[model samples]
Target: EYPTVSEIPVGEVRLYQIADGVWSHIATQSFDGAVYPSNGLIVRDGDELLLIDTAWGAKNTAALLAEIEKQIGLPVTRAVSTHFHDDRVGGVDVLRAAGVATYASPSTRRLAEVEGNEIPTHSLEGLSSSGDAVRFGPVELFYPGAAHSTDNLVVYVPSASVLYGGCAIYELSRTSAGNVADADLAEWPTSIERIQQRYPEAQFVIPGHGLPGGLDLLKHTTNVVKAHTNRSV
Candidate 1:
């Protein structure tokens, strides 16, 4: 099991180190009195730090960054958003202002542009469809297929054998599909299956929300998607 080595709370967000060179940032916000906590990652490769997703809001994201610089003593050189949602890309503008090279899939950029969502500065061009891989330092971004969203991507850190499944994968305690307005229920399981096929030894799997776990998180997400699809039909 992955244990927390250090933790620092920054307002609505909390940052913690899950493993060597890998940190987790969870932002908690309330909507209609229902609390939701979104999880993201901070990966260190050599002297470079890579941000996965941002805090739920711009201010929260700034706080997260401040603490990272003060506590971690390193600036984020690059970042990648798993999708175009605000929870994922809300801090793109902040990163851009800070001159951080942030990347998103072409589809994510298009969708963000069309939907007026926060957009990342750079695009992972030539990554046309699912099952594509792009390397960013020690991070390997793979777009399995349309699951949580049409452009959802997963981040893999081979050195640590960890997978940041984003919203495409579910936490162990989640029984229902959290958000699926842009989800493809029919392809969710298959997308997860592809990830399972590719990373058989991913010991630490982190979801977009909740705590991190092993590969069982991927299987649980598949099962949850299937159960939800069956119930809807």
Candidate 2:
């Protein structure tokens, strides 16, 4: 090794509480040349115990399940992906091994294949969209058009006003669209605005990366996209 012996960075998987019955996990991994973190969520929507996205990859996903077990007596039945990004759905295959039913958009399925990733067990693509009111008990998956990725989904829990704005949006630290390898820059702005209109009352807004915050993050996301696209206002 020259400067240093290269190592595949594997960060800790930590958990946090966003709201009542809402839990989030931040899975750490280093890829594409730096330390990276991914977020996944677990919540109770009425009688359903649903997971939103999986951690960074296999080991982290398995680590997350261990925490889930310690927290909920090993109960995780359903899951969802915000998009097909590795950080978002990387653990889907791990979940499959555990026999959990994973859900996602049809677009996510197609793109996942393009990325050489695993497919969700239940594809809610033709099955739904942002305007369709796709609800699993009460965890609503909103597709506010393409942004970070064509199939990126924003999840909202009306019961808690907590929005899990997947990579379609970003946390505050990012002043620009984080990864555009598969993004729709022109559509990013409106995609976030739709989130503003749909969940103006959101109290806890969780981004795919970085720290979670309030509704201000939504507006910030809109502004970031605007700047990235040469829009002043």
Q: Candidate 2: which stretches are off by over 4 Å?
A: 1-11, 45-48, 125-130, 231-233
Model 1 lDDT per residue over 62-91, tens place: 877887888788889888889989889987
Backbone clash pairs in model 1 (N, Cα, C under 3 Å; residues 3+ apart or in different chains), count: 0
How well does candidate 1 match the true structure in TM-score terms?
0.93
TM-score of 2: 0.89
The most accurate candidate by TM-score is: 1
Residue pairs clashing, model 1: none
Global local distance difference test of model 2: 0.79
If scored against the real structure, what TM-score would every candidate get? 0.93, 0.89
Estimate every model's Cα lDDT from 0 to 1.
0.85, 0.79
Q: Candidate 2 lDDT, tens digit per residue, 1-233?
A: 10111232364566777778887887777767777677778887555568898887888889888877886654688889889988878889899898889888888988998889978888884434544447775687788888888888888888788899988767888886677888888888887888888888888898888778888888898888878778566
> Candidate 2, 210: how far from true, in Å?
1.0
